[PDB]
Amino acid sequence: LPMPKFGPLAGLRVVFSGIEIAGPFAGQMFAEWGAEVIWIENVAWADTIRVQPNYPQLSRRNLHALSLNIFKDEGREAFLKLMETTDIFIEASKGPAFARRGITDEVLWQHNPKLVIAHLSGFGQYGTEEYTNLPAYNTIAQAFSGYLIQNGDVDQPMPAFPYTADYFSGLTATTAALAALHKVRETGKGESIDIAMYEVMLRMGQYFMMDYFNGGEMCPRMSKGKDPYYAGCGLYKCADGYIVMELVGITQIEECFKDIGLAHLLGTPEIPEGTQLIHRIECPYGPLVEEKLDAWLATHTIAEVKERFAELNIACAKVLTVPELESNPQYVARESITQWQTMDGRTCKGPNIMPKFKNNPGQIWRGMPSHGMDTAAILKNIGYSENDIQELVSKGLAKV
Amino acid sequence: LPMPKFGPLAGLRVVFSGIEIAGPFAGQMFAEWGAEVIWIENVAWADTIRVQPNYPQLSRRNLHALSLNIFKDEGREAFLKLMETTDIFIEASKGPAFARRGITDEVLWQHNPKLVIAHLSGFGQYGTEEYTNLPAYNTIAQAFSGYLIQNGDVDQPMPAFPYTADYFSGLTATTAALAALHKVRETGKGESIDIAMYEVMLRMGQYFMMDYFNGGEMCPRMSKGKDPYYAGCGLYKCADGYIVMELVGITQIEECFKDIGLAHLLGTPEIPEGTQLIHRIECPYGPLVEEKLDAWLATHTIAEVKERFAELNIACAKVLTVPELESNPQYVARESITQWQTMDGRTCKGPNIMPKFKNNPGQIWRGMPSHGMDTAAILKNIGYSENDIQELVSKGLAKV
Numbered sequence: 001l002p003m004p005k006f007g008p009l010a011g012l013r014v015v016f017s018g019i020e021i022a023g024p025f026a027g028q029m030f031a032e033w034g035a036e037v038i039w040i041e042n043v044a045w046a047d048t049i050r051v052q053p054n055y056p057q058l059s060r061r062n063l064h065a066l067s068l069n070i071f072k073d074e075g076r077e078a079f080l081k082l083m084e085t086t087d088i089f090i091e092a093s094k095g096p097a098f099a100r101r102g103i104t105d106e107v108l109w110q111h112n113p114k115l116v117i118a119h120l121s122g123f124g125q126y127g128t129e130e131y132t133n134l135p136a137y138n139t140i141a142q143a144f145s146g147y148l149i150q151n152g153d154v155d156q157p158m159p160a161f162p163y164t165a166d167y168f169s170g171l172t173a174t175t176a177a178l179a180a181l182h183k184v185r186e187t188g189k190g191e192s193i194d195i196a197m198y199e200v201m202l203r204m205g206q207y208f209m210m211d212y213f214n215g216g217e218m219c220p221r222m223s224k225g226k227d228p229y230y231a232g233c234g235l236y237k238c239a240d241g242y243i244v245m246e247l248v249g250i251t252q253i254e255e256c257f258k259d260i261g262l263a264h265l266l267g268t269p270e271i272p273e274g275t276q277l278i279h280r281i282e283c284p285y286g287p288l289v290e291e292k293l294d295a296w297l298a299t300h301t302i303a304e305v306k307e308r309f310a311e312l313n314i315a316c317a318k319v320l321t322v323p324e325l326e327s328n329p330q331y332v333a334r335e336s337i338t339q340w341q342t343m344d345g346r347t348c349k350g351p352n353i354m355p356k357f358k359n360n361p362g363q364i365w366r367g368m369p370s371h372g373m374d375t376a377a378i379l380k381n382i383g384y385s386e387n388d389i390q391e392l393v394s395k396g397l398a399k400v
Numbered sequence: 401l402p403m404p405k406f407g408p409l410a411g412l413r414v415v416f417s418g419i420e421i422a423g424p425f426a427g428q429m430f431a432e433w434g435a436e437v438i439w440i441e442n443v444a445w446a447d448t449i450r451v452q453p454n455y456p457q458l459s460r461r462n463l464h465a466l467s468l469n470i471f472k473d474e475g476r477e478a479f480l481k482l483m484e485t486t487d488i489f490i491e492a493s494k495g496p497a498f499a500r501r502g503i504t505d506e507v508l509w510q511h512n513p514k515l516v517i518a519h520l521s522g523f524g525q526y527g528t529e530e531y532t533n534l535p536a537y538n539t540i541a542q543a544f545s546g547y548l549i550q551n552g553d554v555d556q557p558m559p560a561f562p563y564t565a566d567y568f569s570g571l572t573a574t575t576a577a578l579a580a581l582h583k584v585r586e587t588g589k590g591e592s593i594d595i596a597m598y599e600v601m602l603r604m605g606q607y608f609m610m611d612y613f614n615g616g617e618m619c620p621r622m623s624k625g626k627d628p629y630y631a632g633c634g635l636y637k638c639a640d641g642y643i644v645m646e647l648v649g650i651t652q653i654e655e656c657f658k659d660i661g662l663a664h665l666l667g668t669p670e671i672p673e674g675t676q677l678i679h680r681i682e683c684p685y686g687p688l689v690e691e692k693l694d695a696w697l698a699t700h701t702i703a704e705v706k707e708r709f710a711e712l713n714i715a716c717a718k719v720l721t722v723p724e725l726e727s728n729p730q731y732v733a734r735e736s737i738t739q740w741q742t743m744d745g746r747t748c749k750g751p752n753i754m755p756k757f758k759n760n761p762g763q764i765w766r767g768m769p770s771h772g773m774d775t776a777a778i779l780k781n782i783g784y785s786e787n788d789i790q791e792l793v794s795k796g797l798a799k800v
């Protein structure tokens with residue numbers, strides 16, 4: 001298919017079947033970085049992402065759109081033919097749904113024995129009958145992994161937002177699919193990858209959970225965005241807004257304590273000389289430290305705190321609101337937010353390609369395609385005639 | 401170096417320089433999947449991760465440990481020699497610190513023109529003098545990217561937890577490094593990757609931010625864990641505790657409305673037949689749906705609701721606490737939590753390898769190594785004599 005040659009993944013052919021965030025995010029990252037990526041949609045039912053007015057202009061850029069019933073008659077035949085030239089196939093579904101509909105890994109490999117197959121599900125491709133076939137979204141994966149219980153305030157759990165587990169899960173699928181592709185180059189043999197969203201999020205939530213599994217206690221939740229375990233770390237209110245800070249280091253603690261009126265705690269059994277990080281659970285002065293930190297920060301503007309904290313080498317940042325990003329100097333210098341043209345000729349603003357590859361940078365070469373926009377070109381490219389395509393369309397097995 | 405042959409990344413040589421979560425997570429993931437990974441630490445002090453009693457047993461498993469001053473004299477020479485047989489080098493530091501210390505990308509490529517170099521920083525490798533050389537922290541990246549302001553409750557922002565940005569940034573570096581490695585295999589030319597943590601997190605926070613960038617409004621924060629825009633989605637209370645649900649789909653909405661007392665809303669101009677999602681602010685009955693949902697869930701147990709939503713194909717799950725995971729049927733069936741031996745002979749419990757590769761699964765072959773445990777074997781492997789190694793040690797440039 002016609003497109004510019006760019007990025008580390010030029011020449012790669014990637015196909016995904018899935019909707020909304022997780023599966024499509026996995027596939028579309030390949031497209032940010034140069035790959036030929038094909039988005040499969042159902043014929044009567046488009047990806048529900050298309051209901052959002054702006055997000056998909058970002059989340060479906062650089063893609064080719066195919067609309068095909070991949071499970072019926074000529075539709076299935078065209079899908080399996082497509083697999084013959086495909087390097088990586090990503091599918092998101094409820095457990096082993098493809099296998100239930102006749103498309104097993106074995107069937108895919110009969111068409112391409114080198115195929116990397118990434119299966120993204122909520123609960124895995126195997127397990128128990130109770131959980132394996134359950135529908136999952138982000139919130140379910142957070143709940144089921146112990147991630148949700150660690151987010152929110154002391155007395156109110158909540159999910160991490162927006163849709164955090166969907167992005168972790170998609171990104172993991174991209175990572176694993178690339179690692180599998182690497183091995184194909186040596187062995188000439190494909191691979192199947194079982195990415196369960198709850199196992200993804202299980203791993204992301206281990207920092208303190210590992211204490212629970214190994215004799216210790218679990219950590220409590222944050223109190224108003226303050227770290228549950230480390231004093232002077234996390235979210236604080238200044239006179240004119242929010243900041244984050246990380247009170248870490250010997251001199252940092254001593255200078256900060258001088259400023260806030262707690263020099264007299266320094267060099268005591270509770271806070272000995274050379275302390276570099278205050279453990280709030282262990283420390284009986286934890287609450288006093290937070291009281292005096294809050295009081296000092298409350299009487300100073302963000303700018304004054306940043307100036308002082310720079311003198312003291314204390315890490316901090318203003319909590320930026322969305323309207324402050326586009327004019328921020330670092331964003332401007334790095335072109336972190338850019339613009340591109342949609343398919344219908346309108347200017348769209350959003351994040352540039354990330355990360356920045358020095359020798360082979362990504363680029364935005366196409367806006368989001370419409371439903372079935374490239375069906376005819378894709379089918380022609382894999383050997384269908386104009387007549388064949390019209391007959392698929394007339395049976396309702398494809399949409400152009 | 402001696403180790404079992406397994407996984408998709410068998411044979412790959414990866415080296416990382418960094419401490420704590422973000423850069424080491426990127427490196428260690430290669431080790432989960434079969435790569436030879438060398439963890440560099442300083443000589444007279446170690447990675448600060450080691451202070452944590454349990455987590456490092458997970459976050460540094462399957463690793464080899466090198467203690468070497470890579471920037472000074474014969475230590476720099478030994479590091480640049482190591483690069484000659486390294487496929488991927490990952491480093492986390494404050495902006496272009498390696499370049500300031502004398503090791504530019506050009507110097508690395510003089511030793512290995514194929515080298516994939518992943519540079520992980522808070523604010524990127526270039527930009528403004530004000531921000532580029534600032535410290536990298538999870539809280540700062542969330543603050544600076546607009547991620548933090550979206551998390552939390554209506555009148556209380558908070559970071560996503562635990563240290564969510566470090567994991568996203570590390571995982572991205574792994575993905576990007578594997579993409580660049582694919583390009584090396586095609587062209588023979590190495591690559592330098594500039595992973596700015598704030599740009600990673602910017603992308604993960606776009607679902608609603610894209611509305612702001614293109615003429616619309618930014619979305620509010622969740623209220624007690626309920627989605628800010630979609631009704632029937634997020635955190636709810638049953639008679640005996642918390643669940644999450646996602647009220648999504650045509651039949652799902654119909655059947656749920658019937659159960660909760662809103663059958664009379666169906667097939668009207670406000671809720672047309674075939675409605676798949678309730679937009680809580682656009683729908684005049686959004687608040688009514690939440691009232692009726694809350695009331696129905698309150699009179700039923702978690703088991704009762706799970707059963708009904710299984711019937712209706714409505715995604716839900718109990719919000720699991722950490723003590724509930726190990727005995728959960730899906731966790732048991734999939735061995736999602738397993739056990740292994742530490743290097744000093746104790747049993748450690750924690751997550752298994754994820755994801756599950758069918759043909760070439762990962763495995764746990766080694767506990768976390770001690771400080772400089774493999775220094776002598778690594779240096780010997782790249783051609784240093786017994787006496788050369790002792791000289792490095794005497795000069796304080798290496799630790800064995």
Ligand SMILES: CC(C)(COP(=O)(O)OP(=O)(O)OC[C@H]1O[C@@H](n2cnc3c(N)ncnc32)[C@H](O)[C@@H]1OP(=O)(O)O)[C@@H](O)C(=O)NCCC(=O)NCCS
Pocket residue numbers: 017018019020021022023040041042043068069070071092093094095097101120121122134135136137138166
């Ligand atoms: C997203 C999800 C919950 C939707 O549930 P669903 O039951 O698949 O609902 P859909 O309406 O999307 O699919 C209905 C059928 O159309 C099928 N279908 C998909 N693409 C098709 C195509 N091109 N042609 C014909 N049928 C297709 C689906 O596979 C499904 O078949 P099944 O009922 O035999 O399992 C489900 O795919 C899932 O749990 N996926 C894994 C987790 C995930 O990715 N969640 C989204 C994160 S944002």
